[PDB]
Write a protein that binds this ligand. Structure first.
Ligand SMILES: COc1cc(-c2cnc3ccc(NC(C)C)nn23)ccc1C(N)=O
Length: 385
């Protein structure tokens, strides 16, 4: 036997999962299309009506679950939505999906892109978590993508930028408990970022302590190494995203421009663009002095003695001179000997990594220092102005 509420139809045996409110997701069909059917209860009819409407307005984005139809009977309301592979919670909690060869930073780009679309439409999610972030079915070209999904707890803003004081514990922003705004979704995103990166951990600890810890601002990003470039860049972003002060949190569009998302080519191109921007530039200059404000430690006192034996043969405590050296070796790469291009190359991937491995604070330091040129035409692909 099957449930038929035309054009929506599902077999009650095929249950994908649940929803804490009493809602249950099934595998079903709408208009000869394989869909996921959500069976919401009469008490929750308000949520579904908000949900269906906000989806009608935003499902055209690729990182937002496609909504199909809504049909009511004498007992329930049914929502036909896009059928996906699994949730982000199942993806992270089961390392079988690893064979799918999905890129963690790309799922997060897709999730942030989906969220950034919502925010632009003046929609705050208020319930962003791994259960609601879904992993699509592979298309004809084998591509899989992340999507936003539980639209029940959303709120559309208007003239002003304020929400009033609600969700699922462990992922709620501190201000929603204690005015709240789009930055509530940035906090929940920050937690989701660390959870995928750490392959299961959460900044605020174990599932039951998490919300009590958010209230106390007691967190840990200890899966991130202080001297591993990949982890260092990741920490920078996550720390700002999970800030106890909403004012200190970056916007969705700010998050998408962060080096965390940059390719190895982009990472190297940024080092070219900055070292090209410096000179002609005097030390007394507010750009040079801001960049020199620090390492020393970033450059590990002398950036020459920690470099490879064949490269050192080809000031020694300057980030400005280290980046100038990098520019000179990148430019004159094919007009350089085989011995030095073997230990450094191949350009661009293995080239930039040679310095990011040996100096894990170089990109993180240069990026937040060079934030002074955030308005410049040259630095538009690096910051959000
Ligand atoms: C989180 O709930 C949703 C899930 C789906 C959905 C679509 N395809 C799949 C495949 C597996 C699956 N696993 C279950 C939920 C554990 N869910 N799901 C679609 C929409 C919603 C919503 N809350 O609106």
């Amino acid at each position: 036997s099957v449930v038929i509420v035309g054009k929506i139809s599902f077999c009650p045996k095929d249950v994908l999962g649940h929803g804490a409110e009493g809602t249950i997701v099934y595998r079903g069909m709408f208009d000869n299309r394989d869909v996921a059917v959500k069976r919401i209860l009469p008490e929750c009819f308000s949520f579904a009506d908000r949900e269906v409407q906000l989806l009608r307005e935003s499902d055209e984005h690729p990182n937002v679950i496609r909504y199909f139809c809504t049909e009511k009977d004498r007992q329930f309301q049914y929502i036909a939505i896009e059928l996906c592979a699994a949730t982000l919670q199942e993806y992270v909690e089961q390392k079988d999906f690893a064979h799918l060869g999905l890129e963690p930073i790309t799922l997060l780009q897709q999730t942030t892109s989906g969220l950034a679309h919502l925010h632009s439409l003046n929609i705050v999610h208020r319930d962003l978590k791994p259960h609601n972030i879904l992993i699509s079915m592979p298309n004809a070209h084998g591509k899989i993508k992340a999507m936003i999904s539980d639209f029940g707890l959303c709120k559309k803003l208007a003239v002003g930028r304020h929400s009033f004081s609600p969700g699922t514990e462990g992922w709620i922003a501190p201000e929603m408990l204690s005015n709240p705004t789009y930055t509530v979704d940035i906090f929940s995103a920050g937690c989701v970022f660390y959870y995928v990166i750490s392959e299961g951990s959460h900044p605020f600890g174990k599932s039951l302590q998490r919300q009590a810890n958010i209230l106390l601002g007691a967190c840990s990003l200890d899966c991130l190494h202080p001297e591993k470039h990949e982890d260092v860049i990741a920490r920078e972003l996550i720390e700002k995203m999970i800030a106890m002060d909403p004012q200190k949190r970056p916007s969705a569009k700010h998050v998408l421009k962060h080096p965390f998302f940059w390719s190895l080519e982009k990472q190297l191109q940024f080092f070219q663009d900055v070292s090209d921007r410096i000179e002609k530039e005097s030390l007394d200059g507010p750009i040079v002095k801001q960049l020199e404000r620090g390492g020393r430690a970033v450059v590990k006192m002398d950036w020459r003695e920690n470099i490879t034996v064949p490269l050192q043969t080809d000031k020694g405590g300057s980030v400005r001179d280290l980046l100038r050296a990098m520019r000179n070796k990148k430019h004159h790469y094919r007009e350089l000997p085989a011995e030095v291009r073997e230990t450094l190359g191949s350009l661009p991937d293995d080239f930039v990594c040679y310095f990011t491995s040996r100096f894990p604070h170089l990109l993180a330091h240069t990026y937040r220092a060079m934030e002074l040129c955030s308005h410049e035409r040259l630095f538009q692909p690096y910051y959000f102005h």
